[PDB]
UniProtKB/Swiss-Prot annotation, chain B:
Gene Ontology BP annotations: translation
This protein's record includes keyword rRNA-binding: yes
Protein name as catalogued: Small ribosomal subunit protein uS3
Signal peptide span: none
Organism: Escherichia coli O45:K1 (strain S88 / ExPEC)
Curated annotation (Swiss-Prot), chain C:
GO MF term list: mRNA binding; rRNA binding; structural constituent of ribosome; tRNA binding
GO cellular component: cytoplasm; cytosol; cytosolic small ribosomal subunit; membrane; ribosome
Function: One of the primary rRNA binding proteins, it binds directly to 16S rRNA where it nucleates assembly of the head domain of the 30S subunit. Is located at the subunit interface close to the decoding center, where it has been shown to contact mRNA. Has been shown to contact tRNA in both the P and E sites; it probably blocks exit of the E site tRNA.
Note: The strain K12 sequence is shown. Has been predicted to contact the N-terminal domain of IF-3 based on footprint studies; exactly how IF-3 interacts with the 30S subunit is controversial.
Organism whose genome encodes this protein: Escherichia coli (strain K12)
Effect of K35 to A/E: Defective in ribosome assembly
Family indicated by similarity: Belongs to the universal ribosomal protein uS7 family.
Shown part of the complete sequence: 2 to 152 of 179
Keyword annotations: Ribonucleoprotein, Ribosomal protein, RNA-binding, rRNA-binding, tRNA-binding
Keyword Isomerase: no
Effect the entry attributes to changing M115G: Significantly decreases affinity for its own mRNA
The name this protein goes by in its record: Small ribosomal subunit protein uS7
Amino acid sequence: QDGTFDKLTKKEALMRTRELEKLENSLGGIKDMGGLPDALFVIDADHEHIAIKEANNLGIPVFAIVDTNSDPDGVDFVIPGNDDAIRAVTLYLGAVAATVREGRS
Amino acid sequence: GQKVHPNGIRLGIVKPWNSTWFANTKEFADNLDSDFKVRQYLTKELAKASVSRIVIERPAKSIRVTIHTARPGIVIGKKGEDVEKLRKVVADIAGVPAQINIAEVRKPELDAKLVADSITSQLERRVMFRRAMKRAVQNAMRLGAKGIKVEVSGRLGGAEIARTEWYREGRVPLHTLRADIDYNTSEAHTTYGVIGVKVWIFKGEI
Amino acid sequence: PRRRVIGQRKILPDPKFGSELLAKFVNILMVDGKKSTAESIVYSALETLAQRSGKSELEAFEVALENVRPTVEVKSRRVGGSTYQVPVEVRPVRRNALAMRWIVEAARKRGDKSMALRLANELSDAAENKGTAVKKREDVHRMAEANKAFA
Amino acid sequence: RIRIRLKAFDHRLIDQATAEIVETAKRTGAQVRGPIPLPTRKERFTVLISPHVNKDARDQYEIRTHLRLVDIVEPTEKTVDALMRLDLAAGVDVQISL
Amino acid sequence: AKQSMKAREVKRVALADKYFAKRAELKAIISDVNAASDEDRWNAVLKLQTLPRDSSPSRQRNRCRQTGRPHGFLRKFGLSRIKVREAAMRGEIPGLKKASW
Amino acid sequence: NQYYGTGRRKSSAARVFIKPGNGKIVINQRSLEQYFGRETARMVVRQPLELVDMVEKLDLYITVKGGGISGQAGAIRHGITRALMEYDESLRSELRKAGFVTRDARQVERKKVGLRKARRRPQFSKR
RNA sequence: AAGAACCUUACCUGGUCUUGACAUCCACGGAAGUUUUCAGAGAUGAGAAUGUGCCUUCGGGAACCGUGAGACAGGUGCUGCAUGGCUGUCGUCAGCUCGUGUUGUGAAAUGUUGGGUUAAGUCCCGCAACGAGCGCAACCCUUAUCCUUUGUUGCCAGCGGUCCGGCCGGGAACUCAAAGGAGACUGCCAGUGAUAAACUGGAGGAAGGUGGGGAUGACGUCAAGUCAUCAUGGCCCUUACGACCAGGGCUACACACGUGCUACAAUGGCGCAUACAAAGAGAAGCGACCUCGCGAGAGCAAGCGGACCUCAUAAAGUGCGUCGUAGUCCGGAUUGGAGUCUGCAACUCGACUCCAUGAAGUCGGAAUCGCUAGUAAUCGUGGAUCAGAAUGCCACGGUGAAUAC
Ligand SMILES: [Mg+2]
């Protein structure tokens, strides 16, 4: 952003821009984590099977929202609801955000 | 035996020449023979003193030998006796008064010839080839280097068949020409035969 | 080739009156890379044919060529089993070149006095369709029209 | 007058050798002509990389010899001896002719 | 590499530079188209056998100086092709790098 | 007054000085008809002179060395095209849509080791 | 093997030498060295004249040479199936792997597969994979266009006079020349494509998509080739398998094969007049000029350890005259005399020019190789090897195609 971005080559500058965009939209949210997470709020258990399969391999609660076609086996606290409709997910997720943020009291 | 010499391929790009002198086609061969003779004699004499390379220049019909080593104290002796001893026993054959000059390096674990000498000296003490190779590579990498690759070949372990074993650590690009790569081979004559040990030390990329 | 879909090269036009077809004809006359001599022979035969038939250098060639210009050629395209011939229409860029090649091949033989005289006689003969290049054309047309069952 | 012809192997050494030998003679012995190119002599060699059969495998080496003329015009006192006993920056065969 | 042959060759060199290159007039100046057409030149060629079968410059094979190899020799460096390649790749010969053009 | 083109093609090197006057060509103290005008490729120098006529505009004092007949002639052609600069791209836009500006290096390849003439292998045989 | 007359030579016959030809130690006697005669194939033996310093521990020393024993030397003798190093090949083919994680009891798998694109696991996208290394590409050299310093033994457009030879004044514009930079990097536009990678086409540009060429050779395979270039484990000879020399052979020929040259002719052979190159070598060598011969070469003898001097006249090509499709003027093999050049010596066993001779051969069976561009085809030039000795090797340059459905 401030140092070396127009030094070597314009093609390589575009290369680095593409690399940064890819790395950020892939692993940009968990950037400032710094350690291991404590809870994994997941939106699906049938589609994102491997996420829970990995989170259950160690002592991390993986309570999540599951629909009818998923396996409520490895999840800690199953939440029955919809996973695709935006309205449904946003209601659940707004409740989640309010409960976590007032928990910062 | 299918690769090119990493030093010969970079003699003009990065790595310089060992002998830097100009002579015309009449005495070129005589000069090269004198250089070879002084080099082999100096090595046979200072084998126990760690010399990696010997630069042989000749300013104005006066030979100058810059000995790059790691232990200059054993080379010069107290009061410097051995240096003038070498000067005499070198000028006896060079034909002119020789000006020899020692130069030490405080990182002997990064020189190809020095590492090969260590491996050969450790092998000639019945040391395990695996232990020696691993210890040398670990020492080099903890002393500082962007990449190393050692290769031993022969009757290691006293076997009847010969197997070549190489161990690498880091980045060692031999096809990149701008890279600074030290390479040199050492022979080791044991009670069972000859063992060759070559080393690629990727000191830096430029 | 297999992947390269490159096309043909752009040859140099003729140093005489502008013409690419007789330039290609000259290019296919040359042995040992001697182009000056080939151009001299081509010009000699062209003048000898124009003065003898009444037409000019560019028109005379055209009449002769079309008499040796083949229609279809047979080539082996085996399809899962038997190996048979397949008569097919040849592209024009290869058709004219092959006509000129047959002309030069017929002229290589039949040595009258010189190469220029050979080629002028061969062109005159193809003009009335009784030479050897036309005989080769008819041999190709006979190889075709007989094995036309494979299509 | 003074024909100075210097030849060496490495150009990125001979060039600065010429620069120093020219400024150490023009700052006090000016009216010099500079580093004339004097094209390079390329001695090539083609050897066999194997000690035995497989002749088709050969190595190709060459040595370049770069030459330069300085061509000083006037035999000055700031020049004749200031050229002598100053033979550092070795690796370059220098020849002075009167 | 047949130290016998190497000593033989150095002996040849010594004896040749000792006898010839100093008395070559017996075959270079006397064998001339001049008044020496008489028995003088006959006695000259007669004494031309005074010197041993050696001593001639044509019996100098010019072997390598490190190994003593008769084939693959280069008069420029005085070494065979094997050793000249080895030295060139090690960096012993000045200016001699891999050629590419 | 007098303009210049360099020109070079296949080991050739030319110097074409171009001046307004007669339509003659004086090349190496020899005229164009007696230099190479009697051999083939007689108008490889006159090719880029019909799109812009030469008969009664200007003449050329030409020198050329290196290469052969056709090489030197192509070098002369390229030198003429480069010397046509007092009549700059205003005419080169037309001179280029027919060639006459492509350097066309395509130098002879070096003979390769083990080969015969840089492409002809030495007659492989199985047994 | 980048070059067998002797030499090289490692083989054979014959004559010899023996701690030995090559290297170190002890003791003894002699300066070393130089000229020369006898016998011999020579190795060698027997001799004859000369020479006596470098510093004085000065019972001699620092070298050299003559001899005796012992440690030893030497071996191109075997073992590449004991090895190092080096090399070829699959193959500049694009693949070979590792760390962590995950699946599987496990051997293992994933990564590295799949949709596209590329010369390329090149790139993009998807995907329990996330990354990395050796590879690819780039970095290196050369060529291709241009810019800057110098302008010579280089050049000379604009000028002075010319035996018009840039020969001489005169210049750093131009060619060439050795350095440092610019540029060519999918840079921009249109379409297609999953708005990605990328492909196609176009504008500028000398050059479009890795511009042309080269070096650069991945883990490994062939238990591949070399212990005859060299180093070395062990087996052996070590009064010999070691060592010196004269001659011979490696060049032998009932035959078979591979690699090239010469041709088989008229886009051509012969005689004459003509024009256009690059790259290189050179001092116990290249060797101007002049004289002699049809000639290879010889005699005198400048310049050059070199952008000046030499090698060194470039040929194909262009014009003229001849040859009329004949085994012919194509072809040049073999043969006898004589001569030139290197070398101590050219029979075995060199090259070269001339005199006479002229063969087979009239485009080649099955089968088989190279090449997609300045490449092929064709023509000539230089260099390493070398006293001399290539049609081979390496490199340079001239003309310069066809086809790729
Ligand atoms: Mg794979």
